[PDB]
Design a protein around this ligand. Structure first.
Ligand SMILES: [Ca+2]
Ligand SMILES: [Cl-]
Ligand SMILES: [Cl-]
Ligand SMILES: [Cl-]
Ligand SMILES: [Cl-]
Ligand SMILES: [Cl-]
Lengths: 287, 291
């Protein structure tokens, strides 16, 4: 497994729920970067150096993902809810003395990030979300077309052990196919092979796959209900925020009072498919 | 594999799309019985002997299922569309000299049946559909709760080889889980173990699993489009129809939008009416088809 973060250290950060693994590099204002599914912190490897020219960059594995410890889940999926994950990452950031920081997230990590912003806006100076809409919005959009496109939101949310059983036959296939299918190219050619190996190794562990299913179960149930409370109360994120998407601002303006955004010429995996454009947009925004 | 239709004959019926396997028994007016997923013609074993007291009963494996041949599919899933399956079964029935017949279907076979009625109503005297709504209706209701409660429509419809590869590591566990999950009780107690073995052996063949996925792909795409044309156009089935459904399975208001002469009732059952509630299902069918 390759070290794809030149000039970054490696830290296990203690919390009350378990250690968070992170790569840490740079100097200046602090910036946390959160990956999603089916990836690890490594996804940020093409953009984190650019950001570290200006910021102290913390590139964390989500709770239960990568090298982070796996808290024990429960019937309501609680440690893998985005509220819970956000609380754990706030604790981790406190261990570093960061109580007000910038945050960028992608995929599940972006969901942690907007939930963090809704629950604890004082923690964030600025927020960026990469290629997502709020969980509530995806569920509200879940007609035939969406059910077919984002089938994994309901498949992975089926009660255990259904998805776990199926995934264990040929995990490597599935992860590689999901990586590829979500890119513009529809193959793996946008990824560094070393990064793909990180993703594959993580996905090969049944306990790590189980976490991912718990994350999607939370996405279908508690996360949805947490979002629904905010939409019903008319709550909006006050934190200055950037929404980037792969070629949404209308949607985010319903959720956030100070939001800007732009399409990036990319499939889903912006930091790997479009690293120069992504980095430039993030540096400009967070400066 | 057990013979679950003692005294019925066996036929392999040629069509332009491949052979249809059927068990054939009884005497009287012709009645075709069509199973669905993840089953075979054996699902009817607890009702067919009762029906054979009153009808000439033809218990067919769907195109690509059980012992029927498996036509090669195409990009539009054409042979596994309900339109195409219905055409094929019409040909098979003509080979037996049945150009006007009664028809009952369950699950995918019920979808073949109502599509047959929409395309070729003159073929049918009467039709029964067991524990289904039209494909269009399933998709139109789609929202979070249905996506989560009923996920396999979208999963099995993903482009190949995604579901095929996921199903190939441990097929027995998935087929058994689906059979159980759709019953009233959530276990395998409703089924004869010998029938389960038929289902398991069918599902063990990767080519048979590919057909099932193609059937669900058709269900997401062309079948949905075919139904959409009919509902939008206001076309209704004129054939007298029975909708029989499980109280723990899926209606008559829905069907009335699709059919001009429909009656129906629930039965206390999960989805698998002919196995879970065989006496009641047999009686309901005998009454409807004999009246
Ligand atoms: Ca002949
Ligand atoms: Cl996501
Ligand atoms: Cl056709
Ligand atoms: Cl069905
Ligand atoms: Cl249905
Ligand atoms: Cl009964």
């Amino acid at each position: 497994l390759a070290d794809l973060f030149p000039g970054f250290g490696s830290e296990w950060i203690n919390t009350s729920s378990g250690r968070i693994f992170a790569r840490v590099g740079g100097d200046g204002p602090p910036l946390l970067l959160l990956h999603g599914f089916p990836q690890t912190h490594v996804m940020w490897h093409r953009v984190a150096p650019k950001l570290a020219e200006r910021f102290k960059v913390i590139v964390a594995d989500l709770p239960g993902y990568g090298w982070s410890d796996m808290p024990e889940s429960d019937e309501q999926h609680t440690p893998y809810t985005k509220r819970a994950m956000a609380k754990q990452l706030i604790e981790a950031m406190e261990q570093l003395g960061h109580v007000h920081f910038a945050l960028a997230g992608h995929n599940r990590g972006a969901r942690v990030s907007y939930r963090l912003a809704l629950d604890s806006p004082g923690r964030l100076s600025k927020l960026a979300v990469l290629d997502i809409l709020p969980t509530y919005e995806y569920w509200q959009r879940m007609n035939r077309a969406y059910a077919l496109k984002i089938y994994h939101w309901s498949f992975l949310a089926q009660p255990a052990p259904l998805p776990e059983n199926l995934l264990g036959g040929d995990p490597d296939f599935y992860v590689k196919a999901k990586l590829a299918s979500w890119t513009r190219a529809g193959d793996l050619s946008a990824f560094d092979p070393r990064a793909v190996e990180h993703y594959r190794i993580a996905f090969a562990d049944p306990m790590r796959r189980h976490v991912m299913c718990e994350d999607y179960r939370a996405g279908a149930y508690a996360d949805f209900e947490h979002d629904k409370i905010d939409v019903e109360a008319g709550n909006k994120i006050p934190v200055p925020m950037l929404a980037l998407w792969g070629a949404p601002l209308d949607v985010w303006r319903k959720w956030a009072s100070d939001v800007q955004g732009a399409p990036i010429e990319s499939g889903h995996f912006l930091p790997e498919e479009a690293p120069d454009q992504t980095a430039e947009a993030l540096v400009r925004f967070f400066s």
